[PDB]
């Protein structure tokens, strides 16, 4: 029901906040994004979970660079989730990060083939 990530359970909070502070201090024009498949999601997998994405890209454009990485089969859908909410495709990644970043300085996005998280 609520955004549960494996990356948060694999690495402690001192460690993440320190990596996030550094990666923000190193690649300022990009925002660090952790991307994981939501529970119960019937859909392809991502090799990597860690992505530095430019601040100026919209969510729409992101749905699309990811759609390529997973390659959706016929009548698969692809939805995003940040804090249990589908991000408007009009928003940018910089605004999404500003508005939704966890305090380890990472932005967390779950993806699913369903429009409701964990369904």
């Amino acid at each position: 029901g609520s955004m549960k990530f494996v990356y948060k359970e694999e690495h402690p909070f001192e460690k993440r906040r320190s990596e996030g502070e550094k990666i923000r201090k190193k690649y300022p024009d990009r925002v660090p994004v952790i991307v994981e498949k939501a529970p119960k999601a019937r859909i392809g997998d991502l090799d990597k979970k860690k992505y530095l994405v430019p601040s100026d890209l919209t969510v729409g454009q992101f749905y699309f660079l990811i759609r390529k990485r997973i390659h959706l089969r016929a009548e698969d859908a692809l939805f995003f989730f940040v804090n249990n909410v589908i991000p408007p495709t009009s928003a940018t990644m910089g605004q999404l990060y500003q508005e939704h970043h966890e305090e380890d300085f990472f932005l967390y996005i779950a993806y699913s083939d369903e429009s409701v998280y964990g369904l």
Partner: peptide, 7 residues
């Protein structure tokens, strides 16, 4: 470790 998107 981090993948740049787009590179």
């Amino acid at each position: 470790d981090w993948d740049f998107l787009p590179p």
